[PDB]
Design a protein around this motif. Sequence first.
Motif, PDB file in Angstrom:
ATOM      1  N   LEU A  60       0.666  -1.231   0.120  1.00 43.89           N
ATOM      2  CA  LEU A  60       0.040   0.020   0.082  1.00 43.89           C
ATOM      3  C   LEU A  60       0.963   1.235  -0.046  1.00 43.89           C
ATOM      4  CD1 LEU A  60      -2.790   1.307   0.341  1.00 43.89           C
ATOM      5  CD2 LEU A  60      -2.397   1.213   2.826  1.00 43.89           C
ATOM      6  N   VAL A  61       1.860   1.372   0.815  1.00 46.17           N
ATOM      7  CA  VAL A  61       2.914   2.257   0.774  1.00 46.17           C
ATOM      8  C   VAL A  61       3.471   2.569  -0.267  1.00 46.17           C
ATOM      9  CG1 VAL A  61       4.996   3.057   2.011  1.00 46.17           C
ATOM     10  CG2 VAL A  61       3.156   2.590   3.524  1.00 46.17           C
ATOM     11  N   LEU A  62       3.865   1.488  -1.134  1.00 40.97           N
ATOM     12  CA  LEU A  62       4.719   1.617  -2.125  1.00 40.97           C
ATOM     13  C   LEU A  62       3.804   1.882  -3.467  1.00 40.97           C
ATOM     14  CD1 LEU A  62       7.109   0.335  -1.032  1.00 40.97           C
ATOM     15  CD2 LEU A  62       7.157  -1.449  -2.641  1.00 40.97           C
ATOM     16  N   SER A  63       2.504   1.680  -3.397  1.00 36.33           N
ATOM     17  CA  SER A  63       1.317   2.084  -4.426  1.00 36.33           C
ATOM     18  C   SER A  63       1.158   3.521  -4.183  1.00 36.33           C
ATOM     19  CB  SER A  63       0.312   1.326  -4.240  1.00 36.33           C
ATOM     20  OG  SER A  63      -0.718   1.558  -5.133  1.00 36.33           O
ATOM     21  N   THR A  64       1.260   4.176  -2.895  1.00 34.04           N
ATOM     22  CA  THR A  64       0.724   5.341  -2.765  1.00 34.04           C
ATOM     23  C   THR A  64       2.005   6.354  -2.947  1.00 34.04           C
ATOM     24  OG1 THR A  64      -1.107   4.603  -1.517  1.00 34.04           O
ATOM     25  CG2 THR A  64      -0.811   6.888  -1.387  1.00 34.04           C
ATOM     26  N   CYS A  65       2.938   5.965  -2.412  1.00 35.50           N
ATOM     27  CA  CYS A  65       4.137   7.038  -2.521  1.00 35.50           C
ATOM     28  C   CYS A  65       5.096   6.658  -3.523  1.00 35.50           C
ATOM     29  CB  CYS A  65       4.654   6.825  -1.056  1.00 35.50           C
ATOM     30  SG  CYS A  65       3.363   6.786   0.252  1.00 35.50           S
TER      31      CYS A  65
END
Length: 438
Positions: free
Chosen positions: A201-206
């Motif tokens: 999730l963090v990778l997908s958003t940031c």
Amino acid sequence: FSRQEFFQQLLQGCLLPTAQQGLDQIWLLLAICLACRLLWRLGLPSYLKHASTVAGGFFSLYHFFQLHMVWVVLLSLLCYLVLFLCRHSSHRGVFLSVTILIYLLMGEMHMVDTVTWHKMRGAQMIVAMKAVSLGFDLDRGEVGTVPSPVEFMGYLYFVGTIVFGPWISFHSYLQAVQGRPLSARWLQKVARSLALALLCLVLSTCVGPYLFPYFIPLKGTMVRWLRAYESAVSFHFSNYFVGFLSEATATLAGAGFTEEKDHLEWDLTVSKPLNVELPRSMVEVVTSWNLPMSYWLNNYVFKNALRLGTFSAVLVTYAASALLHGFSFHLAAVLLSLAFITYVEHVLRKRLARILSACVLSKRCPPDCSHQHRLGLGVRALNLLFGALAIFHLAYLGSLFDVYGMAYTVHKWSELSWASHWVTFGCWIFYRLIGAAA
Ligand SMILES: CCCCCCCCCCC(CCCCCCCCCC)(CO[C@@H]1O[C@H](CO)[C@@H](O[C@H]2O[C@H](CO)[C@@H](O)[C@H](O)[C@H]2O)[C@H](O)[C@H]1O)CO[C@@H]1O[C@H](CO)[C@@H](O[C@H]2O[C@H](CO)[C@@H](O)[C@H](O)[C@H]2O)[C@H](O)[C@H]1O
Ligand SMILES: Cc1cc(-c2ccc(CC(=O)Nc3ccc(-c4cccnc4)cc3)cc2)ccn1
Ligand SMILES: [Zn+2]
């Protein structure tokens, strides 16, 4: 802002906010899954377990979709009505697939609100997949008797597989109902899945959207392809987030185990990120995208459509997948292109492997295969070329998912000069030529 300011504000800007948001909208679902797991270990009768997960599924559906949940509830009731009406027929899967077709097409016809319908496409997809799979399993004899209403409703409202949950078979659900001893392996599986979900999730958003401007030092064609790639990778990590979260919920509710050789392995895998990010073939990408979904499609759509031919069955499977994800023109175009890409690359790799006696199939060869060249430099070069072609196809198809009907898809694929369709057409031409030359 430049790279310096971006990496000065990254932690407090997009790591912690995204993580907190993603966690605060799943914590109640995880709590209900853990409560279901603890309640199912108390030695209650099976019907009480099914009723408890029906109540938990109702509360989870209300928590995520408010009053709108009625469409999923009416779908479950209609699916049980169809299953009960044809409970003595040998074509239960036929009737359930027809009724799912009517229901989904009615929703696509905008009889129901667009926002409402789009909100819970996933949960409705999983309910439809479960109902069709149970009908076809009753047809093929894998499930012995037609389930009682409480068992069917508990299967449809299994709280580990209700919101983002992977499709599970009825037998897998009943095995979850039996329950397994809470072990360290189970908890480690849940923790690992949750950690991987939050990371994705963090990778997908940031990381994903800002990959090339900052992370990598590296409107010309190169710029367009870089933007396409980063939009594709961001979409991939979003999918991985959903997959790992679904693994976590399903495992945490007590499902997703394999009792092999009297040895329990919590090894439910929904998505294989490494097989997509570093792809051998596009067939592998499609399969690894969603293993339960791919298995469901192959088992319950592809095998039943084999009377139309292999290519027509592939098109029927991809069209059913497009309807299951909801008719949006970009996703339908991606899946229609994916049918041609996977079929052409599969038959071309088979023909190449046969002619050259090489391990250049769309999947890895078994240790006992008749190919003469197994580890040579040419085999590695051909596999690397096909993997680069797969990455190219991924960037092309994922360019449609940046953060939108015919015009948007045509514009985005014309900025890439329709490159992947030309590559697929050239690969098919090459396939025909090499076969003709023999
Ligand atoms: C828009 C695309 C989707 C349309 C969906 C609605 C239409 C109905 C499709 C239902 C469907 C599933 C496949 C699609 C799944 C879709 C899931 C949707 C999910 C959400 C998106 C059921 O599939 C059938 O299921 C039967 C029951 O399981 C099974 O029967 C057997 O096993 C049972 C034991 O398992 C056992 O008990 C039972 O006795 C057995 O007989 C069949 O083997 C199997 O083919 C496909 O329908 C089948 O299609 C066939 C050729 O395609 C078609 O054959 C035709 O062939 C020639 C023509 O080329 C023509 O010459 C033939 O005369 C003609 O016969 C079948 O007639 C039709 O039935
Ligand atoms: C933009 C994008 C999208 C995607 C992407 C999206 C959705 C999916 C789900 C899906 O349709 N799966 C599937 C699984 C199995 C079969 C099949 C066919 C013939 C025989 N047996 C099985 C067909 C389709 C997959 C990939 C990937 C990479 N970039
Ligand atoms: Zn081989």
